[PDB]
Amino acid sequence: NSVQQQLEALEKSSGGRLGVALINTADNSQILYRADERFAMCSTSKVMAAAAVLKQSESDKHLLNQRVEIKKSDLVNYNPIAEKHVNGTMTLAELGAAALQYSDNTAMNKLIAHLGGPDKVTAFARSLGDETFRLDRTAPTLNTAIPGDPRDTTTPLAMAQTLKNLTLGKALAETQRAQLVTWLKGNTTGSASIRAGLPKSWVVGDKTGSGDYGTTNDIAVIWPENHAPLVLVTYFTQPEQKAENRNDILAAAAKIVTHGF
Numbered sequence: 001n002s003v004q005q006q007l008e009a010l011e012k013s014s015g016g017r018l019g020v021a022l023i024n025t026a027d028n029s030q031i032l033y034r035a036d037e038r039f040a041m042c043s044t045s046k047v048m049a050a051a052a053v054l055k056q057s058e059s060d061k062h063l064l065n066q067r068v069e070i071k072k073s074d075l076v077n078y079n080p081i082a083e084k085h086v087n088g089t090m091t092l093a094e095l096g097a098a099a100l101q102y103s104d105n106t107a108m109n110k111l112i113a114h115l116g117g118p119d120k121v122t123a124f125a126r127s128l129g130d131e132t133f134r135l136d137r138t139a140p141t142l143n144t145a146i147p148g149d150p151r152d153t154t155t156p157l158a159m160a161q162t163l164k165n166l167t168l169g170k171a172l173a174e175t176q177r178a179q180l181v182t183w184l185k186g187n188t189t190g191s192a193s194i195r196a197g198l199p200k201s202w203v204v205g206d207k208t209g210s211g212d213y214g215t216t217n218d219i220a221v222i223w224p225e226n227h228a229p230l231v232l233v234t235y236f237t238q239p240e241q242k243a244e245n246r247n248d249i250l251a252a253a254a255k256i257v258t259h260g261f
């Protein structure tokens with residue numbers, strides 16, 4: 001059956017709602033499934049916050065090494081890196097690395113605070129031509145992922161387009177683009193998500209997110225060995241608040257849409 005039929009069948013088996021957008025940069029073709037529907041981004045939103053700081057750094061050569069004080073009161077629900085630095089400092093670069101590669105929620109919050117609040121992350125997305133993205137809350141409440149809640153949402157297509165712009169395209173000056181890509185490639189949290197649906201030796205940069213309603217997300221740039229890059233967003237969410245997360249669904253979707261590549 002067709003790729004579309006395969007995705008529909010995956011969603012049917014899934015017990016939830018699947019959103020996929022793949023951009024094949026070889027020919028600019030797309031594989032879209034519920035790609036204009038809103039999903040809670042959860043921690044995939046951290047890419048936008050880190051990139052907003054990278055944009056600022058273009059015009060401030062001291063920004064990435066700027067010290068940020070980490071206090072006990074900054075710790076939240078999940079902060080494996082920031083907890084190592086309580087009573088000390090981390091640089092903005094180190095906070096970007098922790099936010100993206102470990103999904104440290106304290107690090108995300110420091111990025112947001114530095115920028116001046118969630119609305120400034122939204123403004124940065126808008127500056128990239130993304131009319132869809134919105135950040136409304138800090139971590140961890142940005143991961144509540146309540147069905148139909150527009151807060152902290154985007155669509156798979158909007159996020160795939162913006163991720164392509166960020167990592168391979170026109171959003172950031174070169175040094176900054178390269179830094180974002182280095183961060184994403186070194187992600188530690190994505191083994192069982194998109195990466196698990198791909199050949200083991202393909203190079204991937206990604207950012208995961210998991211929240212309530214079993215909301216299980218991953219956004220990736222994928223470099224095949226003999227082909228142009230693919231940009232892939234896989235979002236998944238479920239009807240019940242305490243549903244288990246389902247990274248296996250994301251891996252399955254990735255395998256479906258990258259077949260033949």
Ligand SMILES: *C(=O)[C@@H](NC(=O)/C(=N\OC(C)(C)C(=O)O)c1csc(N)n1)[C@H](C)NS(=O)(=O)O
Binds near residue numbers: 042102103211
């Ligand atoms: C981002 O998506 C972020 N999610 C959370 O902080 C929530 N749970 O995360 C962990 C991994 C601890 C979990 O047990 O699911 C969460 C659930 S409900 C709520 N308000 N927050 C995590 C840290 N990012 S990820 O990339 O590791 O998924």
